Amino acid sequence: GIHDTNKQAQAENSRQRFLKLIQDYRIVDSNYKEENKEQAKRQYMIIQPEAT
Amino acid sequence: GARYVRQVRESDKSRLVSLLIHGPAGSGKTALAAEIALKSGFPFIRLISPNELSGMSESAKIAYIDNTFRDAYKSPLNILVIDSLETLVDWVPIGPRFSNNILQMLKVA
Ligand SMILES: Nc1ncnc2c1ncn2[C@@H]1O[C@H](COP(=O)(O)OP(=O)(O)OP(=O)(O)O)[C@@H](O)[C@H]1O
Structure with a gap:
């Protein structure tokens, strides 16, 4: 699209949308990590089944 | 504390x-x-x-503490100081995990 302003516009729109997609992915990942932490806290912060 | 010291010094029946x-x-x-x-x-x-x-x-710790209690029964007046019981017995709450043998030895001593 370097020589046609319309093609450049199209490319930039694709870029924006793909960037939004990436952001969404990042968000999901972060949230899930944070949740996995709280569950891993839940399970072991208490007296445990009888010894090995 | 001084009161207790005098008590152990004088009394004939309170031997421990x-x-x-x-x-x-x-x-x-x-x-x-x-x-x-x-x-x-x-x-x-x-x-x-x-x-x-x-x-x-x-085995070495149990041996040592046993020896120390052996040595104190000469000399008809004696004093022992045991510091920071919980760490001697290996306490950590996560399990919790600790060594039971040592605990028993002290409990019997
Ligand atoms: N009246 C007092 N009571 C207690 N400690 C005092 C007093 N006056 C001074 N100290 C200071 O207490 C310090 C020693 O304290 P000690 O070793 O008993 O600490 P502790 O809290 O038992 O330790 P830890 O938590 O590591 O087992 C010394 O530096 C001593 O100067």
Whole structure:
């Protein structure tokens, strides 16, 4: 699209949308990590089944 | 403390007295214990602390503490200081995990 302003516009729109997609992915990942932490806290912060 | 010391000194029937010193961390407990022990003025004084017991093995610790209790039954007036019980017995709450044999040995001693 370097020589046609319309093609450049199209490319930039694709870029924006793909960037939004990436952001969404990042968000999901972060949230899930944070949740996995709280569950891993839940399970072991208490007296445990009888010894090995 | 001094009162208790005189009590053990004089009485003929109370031949064994045990004390416990508890409080928040950093309250300065061992200093008090040592000061009482020193100012008592008995022939025989001894100290069991975690600080000595590093790096050695389980059988070795039980042996050592047994020896120390053996040695104190000469000399008809005696004093022993046991520092920081919980770390001698390997406490960590996560399991919780700790060594039961040592605990029993002290409980019987
Ligand atoms: N009145 C007092 N009571 C307690 N400690 C005192 C007092 N006056 C001074 N100290 C200071 O207490 C310090 C020793 O405290 P000590 O070793 O008993 O601490 P601790 O809280 O038992 O330790 P830890 O938490 O490591 O087991 C010394 O530096 C001593 O100067």
